[PDB]
């Protein structure tokens, strides 16, 4: 979870993603609120189909004391799945998202008991 990796599927060709990567990364930064304490990093880009591309990201957050660390994957996924944020993501061409952290049974039970 500490590695903070979120996989995103885009309904865009790989060449289009790479061709405008600066813009894509900044738009993701804007979705996060645009503060200078958050930085979006691209871990990888992979074609999945003619017009489907997976983009793996993480977000580095800086503390008031200058320390930096990655936003945990579960925390970042939780933000992106919020209805308002998901809609903004869909406007960028995102059609899905996944975190790598395998949740514990108690975490899963909590999510089922409180799906919202």
């Amino acid at each position, epitope marked *: 979870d500490e590695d903070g990796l979120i996989s995103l599927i885009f309904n865009k060709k790989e060449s289009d993603i790479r061709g405008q990567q600066q813009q894509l990364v900044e738009s993701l930064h804007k979705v996060l609120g645009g503060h200078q304490t958050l930085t979006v990093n691209v871990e990888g880009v992979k074609t999945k189909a003619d017009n489907q591309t997976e983009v793996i990201i993480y977000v580095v957050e800086r503390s008031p004391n200058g320390t930096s660390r990655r936003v945990g994957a579960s925390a970042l996924f939780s933000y992106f799945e919020q209805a308002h944020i998901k809609a903004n993501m869909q406007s960028l061409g995102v059609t899905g998202a*996944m975190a790598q952290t395998e949740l514990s049974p108690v975490q*899963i039970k909590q999510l089922i008991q409180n799906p919202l």
Partner: nanobody, 124 residues
Framework: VQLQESGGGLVQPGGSLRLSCVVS?????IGWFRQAPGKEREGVAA????????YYPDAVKGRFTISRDNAKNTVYLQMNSLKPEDTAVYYC?????????????????????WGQGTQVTVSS
């Protein structure tokens, strides 16, 4: 989490089959995946434990339905109007990673827990 399927068989075109899988352990996502001879595993149905949303590829829409009886810890795949192109080994699989969208619900790559599979053959 452990999975064991049942319900496969030899089916005539237009016929029905109902698969079952008994599940032990908690999961975020569970689905059915099929693999025809020499081909890749493809997702045919998935469900979210969090909100009960379901996902299907167009090729089985209206014909396949995934459901659960949580009392029995069992998930089902009801398959109607079967066609020879549906012939395959069918697997139940589960995973504990969060996701949204059909791609990650239906991609076999994104499930870590696999059943043993049950054969489904559709022929006249």
């Amino acid at each position: 989490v452990q999975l064991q399927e049942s319900g496969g068989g030899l089916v005539q075109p237009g016929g029905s089959l109902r698969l079952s899988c008994v599940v032990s352990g908690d999961y975020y996502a569970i689905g059915w995946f099929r693999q025809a001879p020499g081909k890749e595993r493809e997702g045919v149905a998935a469900i979210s434990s969090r909100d009960g949303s379901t996902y299907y590829p167009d090729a089985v829409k209206g014909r396949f339905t995934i459901s659960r009886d949580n009392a029995k810890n069992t998930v089902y795949l009801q398959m109607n109007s079967l066609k020879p192109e549906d012939t395959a080994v069918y697997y139940c699989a589960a995973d504990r990673r969060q996701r949204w969208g059909p791609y990650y619900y239906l991609s076999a790559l994104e499930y870590v827990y696999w059943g043993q599979g049950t054969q489904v053959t559709v022929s006249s």
